[PDB]
Design a protein around this nucleic acid. Structure first.
Ligand code: ADP
Lengths: 580, 97, 99, 109, 88, 111, 98, 100, 83
DNA sequence: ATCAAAACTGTGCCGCAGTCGGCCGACCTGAGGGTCGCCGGGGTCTGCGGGGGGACCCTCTGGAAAGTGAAGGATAAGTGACGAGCGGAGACGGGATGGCGAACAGACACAAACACACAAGAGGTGAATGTTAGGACTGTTGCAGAT
DNA sequence: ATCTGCAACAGTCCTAACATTCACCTCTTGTGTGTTTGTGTCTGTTCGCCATCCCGTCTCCGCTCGTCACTTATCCTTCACTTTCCAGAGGGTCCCCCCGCAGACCCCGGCGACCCTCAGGTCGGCCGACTGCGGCACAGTTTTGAT
């Protein structure tokens, strides 16, 4: 019950930023609110929740604290930030200088939204070519600047520029790169000479980590270093199923909620705009194939039980074998593509079942990958079958990335499926027209969730997003799946924290946290391959049932080489017995 | 008076010669060449074994140090068959009595 | 009108600046990829330290510098200026690294 | 009884080189602090291999010269014509040894 | 198709043509042929093979997987080419 | 058991005579390490370090710096002739060469 | 609290002799490492030569005279002359003056 | 008649054949011995010499000079010649490392 | 005769016989004097090291093992004159 | 295409040098046992390298073109190599004074290993705390080249 | 051959990595004190070998004359490397996300030094006697160079 103790500590060390220049008793010690939006916020108006967040951030400036906006994707973060800046211009009259840091994939949109919502403010961009930047350097040493856009790399590359300026208020963006404490940008921001205030701005809280340490317990508020650098482990030790996690450390969870009420703010998309219809998170499961079978453990039995850190190598055989391409020549030395040689991975039989029949229904399909050699092999097959697709990677140099949205989003675009990488794009796909997502392998993070789901969950789609997820029988990819998903449902606590991080009907963290504990109790209650079943759970309605059964009746008069190649026979037991 | 003994590898060189060619004789000058050759390769291999001893912070020359010194000093095919003869001799020495 | 040097003067100013400086002249990441390739030709599991890659880079760059000096001596002695493969083979035979 | 003192260490491994003499030299030559047990056996096997190889290659070369006795000329031809032995003994000159019959090709008309 | 590592540039070619040319300019060479580049890549390949073979022999003796600074310094010390700086 | 001068301070040296004695004594260079042996060898090592640092300090002054770098040791070692003969196998790291071009490669006086 | 295990170099002694021969000169760290390897290299050469002479005379003791002969064999010319002079001076001072 | 004066070069080739067949010493023993006793007289006065020591020096220095003339012939074929010259010996001792 | 012709006792045809063993087909006129200089420097080095060992053992006879140890530390090993 | 020197074979038989019982001398490996130092080992804390990928910023390489200085071949005068002959001279295999220093044989002292306690020199670590080398701005001119 | 060109070379804040010095914390570890062998030291005797002579011998260096095929210097042609320029792209940083591995400390049994006797393997000088080899003669083959 260290809540009163840390509130006495914030009662002590609140006036650090004041003099130098209950948990409500720091964030609600002053009561001054302005609800009407400022004057020069031209080009539209706010919603109600944007006004409420504006009110909270004015309260943050009045409380002289370093706050965090952490609301959801598609809720106007940039416009709330520029509303804060034009309030601090107009009413607070300090009128500068305002550092902002955004990613390079967003700075065009940020400088564009400066033109709509605040034309009177003086804004400076930063880009390549120091030949261009030398004039802006001499301009910004002169003092005529309020809003200074920049990006991550120009912080360290303009260390001298930012050293020779005394700021007032910075507001940075994209917190999931700030999520590392010993990062180079985080170390330069520690040795930055922080002026007064800073705000992270993330659509995503804690993801594949311990709780919200990196920023919200060390970086953003500098008292929380000297208070909770030791109790990080003591309040992360909840995570041993009934007595620890549910009986006694429910109070530890509630103390985390109580200490993460005043500093944060989080609103939900279904609660205000709700323009997204739905999401249908379905999963299936594949099985092993020829080299992936019981033969594969002999490969580990004579390499290890040899390629280093085999967990990276074990994922290659469950995505698709002969990415090595040394054993491809042991099956197909002529390197000519044909049936049941590409199709010797178990997910790929499911592909040439499902993909021609969603082609029979006409859904626009986002196909995700890690490990871009799998993307190359999928390219080779998807030219072997000749059905239309497009590719995006990390090598597209952003020009064809910005261009390719029109090539995919033509109103009669006969490109239906669409290859992607999960990491790729950097929240810059900005797509809405596709309506089915299938996924080969799963990341270590739920940022695959809160990005690649949101590539169709954003504004502009009215279909029913049917998500599928692939996994084989008894692979290591299963323990990636269960490990990441169920031991990183810790973000469920923060997505429940948001609903009282908002206007806070105070029954939330008891009653609807128990409704969250419905999920926390059917975690392991859910513990302990069909054509018609998968064909139903891909479909939507009865005229898709009609065309799938019509495909069934068309291949009923026909029979449908076999379904999956096996360990042919002696080549598999001769493959990896001569290597090592 | 009785002269102090000069000890060398003469009869051992001559014995290997009578294994590999039963009719050939060796000279005296060539016997001294083979003697100095054996002293030379012994000084090389035991010097390298002692360098491996002092590098690995260890105080005991073992068969592993003699094998690593052989792999370093002798090249190529000679290194391979020398390690072969060594493993054969040490396993026959430990095994049989 | 274009101020083109007569051929040779760029070579002489390069010779003076690279004898005056002392950095490493081969790019670190392709040299490291070469070293890890050649180590993969022996024992397929290995690992290095950054000081070991810089050790091999110091050794190979100082070796090639000494070899190119002796190649320049052999190519001067053949009444030439252009060094050639027979000059490199002569330096590495008279030195005795080949035969 | 006095137990049957026999079976020298050269007899057990099947070596001709004196393993006791090699072990005495490895001890009192101040190489390391304490010589092992397999060490002189391994080392005498290596030296027996090298002497067997060189006397093999010289006895091939005394046959070629029609003479039933190995001379330093024969040891020179054997060592400097085997490539690996040349690269092993490349620093070493052999007394009364001569050189090889090797004329440069571009000298003869 | 385009999936192969056969359609990719091999790794000895990363010792680039101006890098060899710069080594020769430090060496004093005023004018270089066009075949010096290929011959020097062969010479560098053989030299690194010898040094790395001796360093991996030291490493596999010491029952470890990590080639270190001292292992390469010892391989260079018995190579002849003694190196200073990187270890006692 | 009075106060104890170190053996280096007795011998009038700077290099640690006891440390050179134990390095000889544990390196297995002989059975018996003498008494004059670490004193004599520490004096030789002090002389060689004195000569190297003397010449490197002169070349450090001549490039107008006050700090001795590997380039400075490379110039001192390869510009003393007896040190060129002694250290003639050694590669000094970050060394560089002596700046020295042949007289055939230099241009003519006629143009 | 791990107490990084001591590796004992000649760094402070090189620095002390440097502050004798040049009263106001500093030394870079990689140059200190080079002089460290230099002192270990010359020590191992001279001790190895005294080892070979202890074997060759059929004796078992490294003394002042075996180090003197190792100096005269490894060091060239003027260096060897002055190093033998320095050594004889230091040993007679150590033996005579206590 | 005409006395058969050989074409110049063929006598050099038959000498190359007979001195690569034979194996004796080529510098005569007493002149080489007086040389060695001079060069030892540079250092110490009352020295003495086993015949094995003098013949050891003779085997060593003749092997050194035969190796030097082999590498000198390589350099003087490299300069598109046959005649060896003093620049060839100085070049061979410069590449090998004995001079500079 | 009078220590004039010591190195001159390395005769012109003996230098020619060494050069014929080396493979040389045709010889200049200054090869002779340069080879005399080369031989003298090499023997100065070897006899300096052999006299250093002989002084060290407190004896007055430069022997074959002293020459072999001098040549061995020179870098040129000598087989056949002592174990 | 035929005569001409000459070097490799073939023969004889002789000087010496390996070689082989041998015989016996002597010293130094073998083993069977006592005992303690070394190293493999199985376990925790800690920091760095691996292995698939992303994002972004630039200098550095790369392809190509115009040009011109070096390489190299064809010729031709120059001459310093080689070859043969022949008259002395120093090297060489033989053999013997003569003396000297190198190699063994013995007693005995100092000199060095070993063990023991300690405190004082030496190694890590912040930590200011400078502070002195790189990173550019103006500015000057020393060396190379188009008219 | 003056003028333009241009790139290396100096002044001058500036910031920051990086020596540098307290400082004091262990904390190793070199030093003082004390037996204990034992390895070197001096003497002292002999003999194997090295220097020093002659000494005939004889073949090999040294000179000298002829002669010519090689070195070297012109001169021409040809082409291949150099320098500049524009564009793109891979090195250089950073970041992701997890694992695994070397290094650094603790008990503990495996084994190699340690004496101590024992016998027989190796060595060395003669002695036997044995065949491999040269050393100055004495025939038949195969390269070289002019008609
Ligand atoms: N009050 C508003 N009125 C009109 N458009 C808005 C408003 N708030 C947000 N938007 C839209 O949201 C987009 C940017 O939202 P953003 O700040 O990126 O929020 P998120 O990060 O949650 O997507 C803009 O294109 C803008 O058109």
């Amino acid at each position: 019950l260290l809540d009163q103790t840390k509130d006495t500590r914030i009662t002590h060390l609140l006036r650090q930023t004041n003099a130098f220049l209950d948990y409500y008793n720091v964030a609600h010690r002053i009561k001054e609110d302005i609800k009407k939006q400022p004057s020069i916020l031209v080009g539209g108006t706010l919603k109600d929740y944007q006004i409420k967040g504006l009110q909270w951030m004015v309260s943050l400036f009045n409380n002289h604290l370093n706050g965090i906006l952490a609301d959801e994707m598609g809720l106007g973060k940039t416009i709330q930030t520029i509303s804060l800046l034009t309030y601090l211009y107009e009413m607070k009259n300090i009128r500068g200088p305002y550092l902002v840091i955004v990613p390079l994939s967003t700075l065009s949109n940020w400088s564009s939204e400066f033109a709509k919502w605040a034309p009177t403010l003086r804004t400076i961009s930063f880009k390549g070519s120091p030949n261009e930047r030398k004039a802006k350097q001499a301009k910004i040493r002169a003092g005529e600047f309020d809003v200074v856009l920049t990006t991550f790399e120009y912080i360290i590359k303009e260390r001298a520029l930012l050293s020779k300026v005394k700021w007032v208020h910075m507001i940075i963006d994209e917190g999931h790169r700030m999520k590392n404490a010993q990062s180079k940008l985080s170390l330069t921001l520690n040795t930055h000479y922080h002026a007064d205030y800073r705000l992270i701005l993330t659509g995503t809280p804690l993801q594949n980590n311990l709780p919200e340490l990196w920023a919200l317990l060390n970086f953003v508020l500098p008292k929380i270093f000297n208070s909770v650098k030791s109790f990080d482990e003591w309040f992360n030790t909840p995570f041993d199923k009934i007595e620890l996690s549910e009986e006694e450390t429910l109070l530890v969870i509630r103390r985390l909620h109580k200490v993460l009420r005043p500093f944060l703010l989080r609103r939900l998309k279904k609660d205000v705009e709700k323009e997204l219809p739905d999401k249908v998170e379905k999963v299936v499961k594949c099985k092993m194939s020829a080299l992936q079978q019981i033969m594969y453990q002999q490969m580990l039995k004579y390499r290890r039980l040899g390629f280093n850190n085999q967990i990276m190598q074990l994922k290659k055989i469950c995505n698709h074998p002969f990415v090595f391409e040394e054993v491809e020549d042991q099956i197909n030395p002529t390197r000519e593509t044909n049936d049941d040689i590409w199709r010797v991975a178990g997910k790929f039989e499911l592909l040439d079942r499902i993909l021609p029949k969603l082609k029979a229904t006409g859904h626009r399909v986002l196909i995700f990958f890690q490990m871009t050699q799998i993307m190359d092999i999928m390219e080779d097959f998807l030219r072997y079958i000749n059905i239309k697709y497009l590719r995006l990677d990390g090598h597209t140099k952003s020009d064809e990335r910005s261009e390719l949205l029109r090539l995919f989003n033509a109103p009669d675009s006969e490109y239906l499926c669409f290859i992607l990488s999960t990491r790729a794009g950097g929240l810059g796909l900005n797509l809405q027209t596709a309506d089915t997502v299938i996924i080969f392998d799963t990341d270590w993070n739920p940022h695959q969730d809160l990005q690649a789901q949101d590539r169709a969950h954003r504004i502009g789609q009215k279909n029913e997003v049917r998500i599928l997820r692939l996994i084989t029988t008894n692979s290591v990819e299963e323990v990636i799946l269960e490990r990441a998903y169920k031991k990183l449902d810790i973000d469920g606590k923060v997505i429940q924290a948001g609903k009282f991080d908002n206007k806070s009907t105070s029954e939330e963290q008891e009653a609807l946290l128990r409704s969250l504990l419905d999920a926390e109790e059917e975690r392991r209650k859910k513990r302990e391959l069909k054509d018609s079943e998968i064909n139903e759970i891909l479909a939507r309605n009865d005229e898709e049932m009609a065309v799938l059964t019509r495909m069934d009746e068309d291949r009923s008069k026909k029979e449908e080489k076999s379904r999956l190649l096996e360990k042919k026979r002696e080549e598999s037991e001769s493959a990896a017995v001569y290597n090592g | 008076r009785r002269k102090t003994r000069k000890e060398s590898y003469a009869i051992y060189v001559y014995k290997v010669l009578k294994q590999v060619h039963p009719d050939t004789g060796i000279s005296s000058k060539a016997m001294s060449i083979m003697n100095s050759f054996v002293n030379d390769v012994f000084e090389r291999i035991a010097g390298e074994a002692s360098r491996l001893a002092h590098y690995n912070k260890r105080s005991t020359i073992t068969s592993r140090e003699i094998q690593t010194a052989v792999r370093l000093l002798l090249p190529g095919e000679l290194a391979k068959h020398a390690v072969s003869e060594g493993t054969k001799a040490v396993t026959k020495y430990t095994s049989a009595k | 009108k274009p101020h083109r040097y007569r051929p040779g003067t760029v070579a002489l100013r390069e010779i003076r600046r690279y004898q005056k400086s002392t950095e490493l002249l081969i790019r670190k990441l392709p040299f490291q990829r070469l070293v890890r390739e050649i180590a993969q030709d022996f024992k397929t599991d290995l690992r290095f330290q950054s000081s070991a890659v810089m050790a091999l880079q110091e050794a190979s760059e100082a070796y090639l510098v000494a070899l190119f000096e002796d190649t320049n001596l052999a190519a001067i002695h053949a009444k030439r200026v252009t060094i050639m493969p027979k000059d490199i083979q002569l330096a590495r035979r008279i030195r005795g690294e080949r035969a | 009884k006095t137990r049957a003192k026999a079976k020298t260490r050269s007899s057990r491994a099947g070596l001709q080189f004196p393993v006791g003499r090699v072990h005495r030299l490895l001890r009192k030559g101040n190489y390391a602090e304490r010589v092992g047990a397999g060490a002189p056996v391994y080392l005498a096997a290596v030296l027996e291999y090298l002497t067997a190889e060189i006397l093999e290659l010289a006895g091939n070369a005394a046959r070629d010269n029609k003479k039933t006795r190995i001379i330093p000329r024969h040891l020179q031809l054997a060592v400097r014509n085997d490539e690996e032995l040349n690269k092993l003994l490349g620093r070493v000159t052999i007394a009364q040894g001569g050189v090889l019959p090797n004329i440069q090709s571009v000298l003869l008309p | 198709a385009k999936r192969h590592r056969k359609v990719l540039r091999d790794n000895i070619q990363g010792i680039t043509k101006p890098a060899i040319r710069r080594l020769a300019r430090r060496g004093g060479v005023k004018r270089i042929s066009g075949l010096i580049y290929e011959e020097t890549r062969g010479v560098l390949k053989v030299f690194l093979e010898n040094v790395i073979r001796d360093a991996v022999t030291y490493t596999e003796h010491a029952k470890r997987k990590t080639v270190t600074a001292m292992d390469v310094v010892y391989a260079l010390k018995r190579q002849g080419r003694t190196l200073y700086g990187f270890g006692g």
